[PDB]
Symmetry: C2
Subunit: 265 residues, 2 copies
């Protein structure tokens, strides 16, 4: 057996407590004035509330409080301009609150559950089963073809933003099989020369991006219109509107562009 | 999420491989994964979900307990890797369904989606998809040597590499650095991703790395580890078996210490 990480249990907040406060409910958190709350606990009417410590940021605790405020409840995407490591802790808070909420009852036997005192787990009052937060591994892949890169627009958001291909890994498959399968299903092409670049959590709602680069091998772009509005090869020096700087998708595109410059220029 | 072909009742003229799973075990009569006609295995009338295809013949999940030869999927690890991966998927999907008979949000009974591997609630709008546990595993190199450690979990005699679950809101790279520090007290450098593998014990996705020693002295976490030490690539102790990603990373780290020295 491999064990999950040990963590401090929740407790009642006092006046002397302080830090960043991720006050969350149903995939949202409190952003008073569009900002992540920071300061002493009385400043935010949180003294007497239960809070879970979910991290530390530059000497200061990061706290999860499970409550819904009347106003200024938003997506964590609103504080994406924050330092990455802080943003990652705010996402952690949002996800942990959904974990707890998703586990009020035990799915094995239907009885009420209660938090573990030593780890981020839900224990059952009736049976021996338990659950840990669900992270959904997700591949994302920049596909290079000579001096070009495959960029797509999703049929969902008419943003005008052309990005790479992404999709959830399925049970029983490797990352490399997920890459190959998602690309096929989304665009009809077979890829080769897969290369892992990096990973990033992505709390929308609970993904872990595993980022790859790959080369065109064979096939015609045949897009699934339910997933994709369009997909085309764009030359490295002639790109459309891309994902923001900071996103793993922009990082992959830039990497691909950089090695087209090193070969064809 | 990905769409899938729905479940259905097996007929006499149904065939393929059968993952007949209940409570984390599957049916392995005489130690073998059932292949052939449904009727040979008294499987007609049962529900099945096709979980894949192996060499032009379907792989089916049947959720049922047999009297004999219920065993761990580890017992079929000798099979081709892609057949082992599908047997593990069946085991994992049976445990997913079992783990979601009731909804965790509202407590009402759930029912399977027909358009994907999901459980939907009879009362509320909430949903669950199968849980996959990203787990890092790292072979640490230091010059002509590799870090191997014995685990407290089972007195195996086996010396293997370091592994741990990725936490919520951390990268694979951060997970590697933290686990190695927590378990062995050392800082590593030049992290390289090698590969991944599903590992259905119960539901892990191994992401395999190689790393180099940077600093620190070996100080073990005595709850997780019995002992840890550096080992010459020409003088290795007992290792995990050659059907594991652990053995692959050790062989890879040993293959390039053979080169340089
Ligand atoms: Zn229970
Ligand atoms: Zn429900």
């Amino acid at each position: 057996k491999i064990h999950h990480h040990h963590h401090h249990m929740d407790r009642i907040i006092e006046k002397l407590d302080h830090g960043w406060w991720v006050v969350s409910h149903e995939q949202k958190l409190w952003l008073p004035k569009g900002e992540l709350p920071y300061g002493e606990a009385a400043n935010f009417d949180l003294v007497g509330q239960r809070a879970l410590q979910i991290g530390e940021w530059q000497g200061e605790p990061v706290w999860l409080v499970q409550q819904q405020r009347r106003h200024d409840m938003g997506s964590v995407r609103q504080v994406i301009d924050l330092d990455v490591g802080l943003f990652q802790l705010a996402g952690r808070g949002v996800q942990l609150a959904e974990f707890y909420r998703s586990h009020k009852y035990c799915g094995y036997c239907g009885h009420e559950m209660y938090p573990s005192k030593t780890e981020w787990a839900m224990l059952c009052s009736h049976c021996r089963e338990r659950y840990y937060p669900q992270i959904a591994p997700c591949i994302i892949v920049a596909i290079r073809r000579d001096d070009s890169i495959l960029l797509a627009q999703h049929t969902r958001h008419r943003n005008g933003v052309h990005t790479v291909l992404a999709g959830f890994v399925e049970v029983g498959e490797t990352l490399e099989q997920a890459v190959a399968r998602e690309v096929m299903e989304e665009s009809g092409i077979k890829v080769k020369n897969l290369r892992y670049v990096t990973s990033q959590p992505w709390p929308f709602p609970q993904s872990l991006m595993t980022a790859f680069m790959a080369e065109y091998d064979s096939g015609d772009i045949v897009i699934d219109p339910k997933e994709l509005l369009e997909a085309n090869w764009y030359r490295y020096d002639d790109l459309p509107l891309l994902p923001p700087p900071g996103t793993v998708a922009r990082r992959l595109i830039e990497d691909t562009v950089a090695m087209c410059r090193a070969e064809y220029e």
